[PDB]
Structure 1
Amino acid sequence: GGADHADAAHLGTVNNALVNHHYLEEKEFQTVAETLQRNLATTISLYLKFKKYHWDIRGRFFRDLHLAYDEFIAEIFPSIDEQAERLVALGGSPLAAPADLARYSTVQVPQETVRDARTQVADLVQDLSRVGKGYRDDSQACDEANDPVTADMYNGYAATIDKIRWMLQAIMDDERLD
């Protein structure tokens, strides 16, 4: 993918004379950086979305979901600083302003108050299906671009996302969940 938005190696600015793409060729950096910026915005958006649903859930599954969402945040949270800094280490600049989260994330954070357990869980399962396949695909893309290092990070993140996807899909595989 195209990564000009995340590339900091060609800026006209102070304290930037040494920035480069280390062992990656320019086109390889473009491929890898598009995945890192997208996955960073996605991870931050999942933190915000798990919190919004943690705060808004009501009804008899409140303890099940309120506590689960915090456990899932704890699993994914460290990857925010790690993905941002992998991008910086390769000569990028990570984006984290609200407008940039909205543009590059594959996950949308709700603006409405969603009380219903099934509505929350089905939304999250759809997101996590996309994000876990995303990391598997992005791992292969990075390996192909001669970046097995970023690929290895993604292999670990995909295992975590796939695990959370299973747990949430299991909870909603029940006709008595309204």
Structure 2
Amino acid sequence: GGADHADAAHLGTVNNALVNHHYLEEKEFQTVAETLQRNLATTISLYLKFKKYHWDIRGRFFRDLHLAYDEFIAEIFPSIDEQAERLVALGGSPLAAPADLARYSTVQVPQETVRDARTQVADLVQDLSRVGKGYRDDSQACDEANDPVTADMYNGYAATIDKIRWMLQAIMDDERLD
């Protein structure tokens, strides 16, 4: 299935003899675990991206954005452990190495210094549009895979992402922001 990279129930290793997918069938785990690993990688990447833009912003919107990004991080950060632990509970092993983040995240972290407010905000709004829709879609997929438990987690994460999206989109809805 589509989550082999995150599946730990079939490993040829020590201290692994009991690992299983609990109440999920194999294909159901594959569906759910693909979502959890992707969203975990995406969340960690949003932390890193919000931090890089918070460190790099300059100009007259510095206080607006520097502080906002830290508030947004505070909202999303607890979901890192929550998503990873859910995956573990279902018989997965979460990936968090840089190369794995890059492969599985739907959000790319900047390698350049972006000083420009509009450039940062527009980039983040595009990211959050994708991530929020992703959580809505992934909630429905999990529920269909007989995992209402993970879906419930995603419903809350989507609400948070959708809120952050609104705020950022509002800031940039302004022709005076160059």
TM-score class, shorter:
over 0.9
Partners of 1:136 and 1:81 lie apart in 2 by 20
Residue deviations 1:49-82 (CA, integer Å, cap 9, x gap): 0000000000000000000000000000000000
Partner of 1:70 in structure 2?
70
Question: Secondary structure at 1:24's aligned position in 2?
Answer: coil
Cα RMSD for the two superposed structures: 0.5
Question: Secondary structure at 1:156's aligned position in 2?
Answer: helix
Deviation at 1:144, TM superposition (A): 0.1
Deviation at 1:11, TM superposition (A): 0.2
Partners of 2:119 and 2:67 lie apart in 1 by 17
Q: How high is the TM-score relative to the length of structure 1?
A: 1.00
Residue deviations 1:86-144 (CA, integer Å, cap 9, x gap): 00000000000000000000000000000000000000000000000000000000000
Partners of 1:170 and 1:57 lie apart in 2 by 18
Partners of 2:20 and 2:2 lie apart in 1 by 17
Question: Secondary structure at 1:92's aligned position in 2?
Answer: coil
Question: Secondary structure at 1:160's aligned position in 2?
Answer: helix
Question: Secondary structure at 1:166's aligned position in 2?
Answer: helix
- Number of aligned positions between the proteins: 178
Partner of 1:81 in structure 2?
81
Question: Segments of 4+ in structure 1 off by > 4 A?
Answer: none
Deviation at 1:35, TM superposition (A): 0.1
Partner of 2:95 in structure 1?
95
Which stretches in structure 2 are left out of the alignment for 5+ residues?
Answer: none
Partners of 1:35 and 1:13 lie apart in 2 by 25
Partners of 1:133 and 1:92 lie apart in 2 by 24
Partner of 1:15 in structure 2?
15
Partners of 2:112 and 2:10 lie apart in 1 by 41
Question: Secondary structure at 1:132's aligned position in 2?
Answer: helix
% of aligned pairs identical?
A: 100
Partners of 2:108 and 2:10 lie apart in 1 by 31
Q: How high is the TM-score relative to the length of structure 2?
A: 1.00
Question: Secondary structure at 2:108's aligned position in 1?
Answer: coil
Deviation at 1:27, TM superposition (A): 0.2
